[PDB]
Structure 1
Amino acid sequence: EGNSVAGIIKSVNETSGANLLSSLKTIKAQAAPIYPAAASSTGYSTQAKIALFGALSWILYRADGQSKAHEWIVDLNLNVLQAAWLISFSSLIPFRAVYFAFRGMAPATASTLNGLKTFSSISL
């Protein structure tokens, strides 16, 4: 669409002097960016259904292959040994510190975006 600043300039120039100060909250609301409101909550997507159906299919196929193996009970308790460390990772990992440490790996999120200053772009 057309840009919002030209809409500000046009609709501010179109107001009368008496109409100006109360129209300013409307004009601002017509120049505010679209932030889409929360739409319909569907169930799971067809790719999410495909993902979890294929994951459960893979887990059942792998458990059936593990049970038919020679040291089958050894494999079935290896699954317990690995799920135990998954459960302990859920408990031990400081996920907020991990998130903010990953934010420091990228330079785009390690710093605030420093660019255009206000004093150079002042219009009058």
Structure 2
Amino acid sequence: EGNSVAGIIKSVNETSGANLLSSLKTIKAQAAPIYPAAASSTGYSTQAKIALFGALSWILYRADGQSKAHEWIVDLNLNVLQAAWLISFSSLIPFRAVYFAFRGMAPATASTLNGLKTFSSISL
């Protein structure tokens, strides 16, 4: 895969003057980058099924031994207390403000890229 500017330079050099201005949208699109198209689902990967069966195999096994733990009704009522905060965190955390607050932790996303200021790289 050669570079697309040498593909632009070649495709503009071997056109004529009459069909130059018509060819400029098919030389533009021949050198556009590939953004791969949204394929069909094929949902829940072979590892997303291990992650959900293995988490269900863990939650059932932990609730099995919680139910015979000599404080079994206190153990099973702590999962209600612990899952009550997972519900209150979905309803109280500002998830767009948290997303943009983690973007400021990283200096790569806290600013814009900064090089190559367009007046230095002209070709007139």
The CA deviation string for residues 88-111 of structure 1, in whole angstroms up to 9 with x for no partner, is: 000000000000000000000000
Q: Which has the higher contact order (CA 8 A, sep 6+)?
A: 1
- Superposition deviation, residue 43 in structure 1: 2.0
Rounded to whole Å, the distance in 2 between the matches of 1:43 and 1:116 is: 42
- Superposition deviation, residue 78 in structure 1: 0.2
Determine which structure has the larger helix proportion and give its number: 1
What is the number of residues matched between the two proteins? 124
Provide structure 2 residue ranges, at least 5 long, that are not aligned to the other structure.
none
Rounded to whole Å, the distance in 1 between the matches of 2:7 and 2:20 is: 15
The CA deviation string for residues 6-26 of structure 1, in whole angstroms up to 9 with x for no partner, is: 000000000000010000000
- Superposition deviation, residue 30 in structure 1: 0.2
Rounded to whole Å, the distance in 2 between the matches of 1:78 and 1:13 is: 74
Task: Give the root-mean-square deviation of aligned CA atoms.
Answer: 0.4
2:29 aligns to what SS in structure 1? helix
Rounded to whole Å, the distance in 2 between the matches of 1:90 and 1:19 is: 59
Rounded to whole Å, the distance in 1 between the matches of 2:4 and 2:118 is: 19
Structure-2 residue corresponding to 1:61: 61
- Runs of 4+ in structure 1 deviating by more than 2 angstroms, as ranges, are none
Sequence identity (%): 100
The CA deviation string for residues 48-96 of structure 1, in whole angstroms up to 9 with x for no partner, is: 0000000000000000010010000000000000000000000000000
1:80 aligns to what SS in structure 2? helix
TM-score (norm. length: structure 1): 0.99
